[PDB]
Design a protein around this ligand. Structure first.
Ligand SMILES: COc1ccccc1CC(=O)N1CCC[C@H](C(N)=O)CC1
Ligand SMILES: [Zn+2]
Length: 139
């Protein structure tokens, strides 16, 4: 689990969004595993606007942060799960690192701010949904 709180927005994995997220929906994209909802309180986070390919993510299944080198956001095949049919997930970045299903929502950051959130993984890989292209989160 986990979320990004920026301005009056909450960014979560679409497959983990709550009834309240859907009732206050701003935008969602099943191909990216992202959902953004509106909030009343001002958020705690800043979004990176950069091309970094190194950063640090939080891994809840180890209670630790790990440094990672990750690929540029791209269209990557993701196998069927309880949450989605087999499909290409867009704006996804892969890295070598530990992840388990409950790790979704962990934040990846670089020196500029929040880069994205854990969305996929397995077999020593971890995949992050990028949010750096969502310029409207900043206003
Ligand atoms: C952290 O992810 C993993 C880690 C280890 C093993 C498996 C996973 C992947 C995983 O749990 N899912 C469920 C959530 C949907 C996701 C997606 N974004 O399409 C792909 C499949
Ligand atoms: Zn950066």
């Amino acid at each position: 689990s986990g979320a990004i709180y920026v301005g009056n927005y909450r960014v979560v994995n679409r497959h983990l969004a709550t009834h309240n997220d859907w009732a206050n929906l701003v935008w969602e994209d099943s191909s990216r595993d992202l959902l953004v909802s509106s909030t009343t309180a001002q958020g705690c986070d800043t979004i990176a606007r950069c091309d970094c390919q190194t950063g640090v993510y939080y891994c809840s299944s180890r209670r630790k942060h790990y440094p990672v080198s990750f690929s540029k956001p791209s269209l990557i095949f993701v196998e069927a799960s309880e949450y989605y049919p087999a499909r290409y997930q867009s704006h996804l970045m892969l890295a070598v690192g530990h992840s388990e299903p409950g790790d979704c929502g962990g934040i990846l950051r670089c020196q500029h701010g929040v880069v994205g959130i854990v969305s996929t993984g397995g077999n020593g890989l971890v995949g992050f949904a990028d949010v750096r292209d969502l310029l409207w989160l900043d206003e």
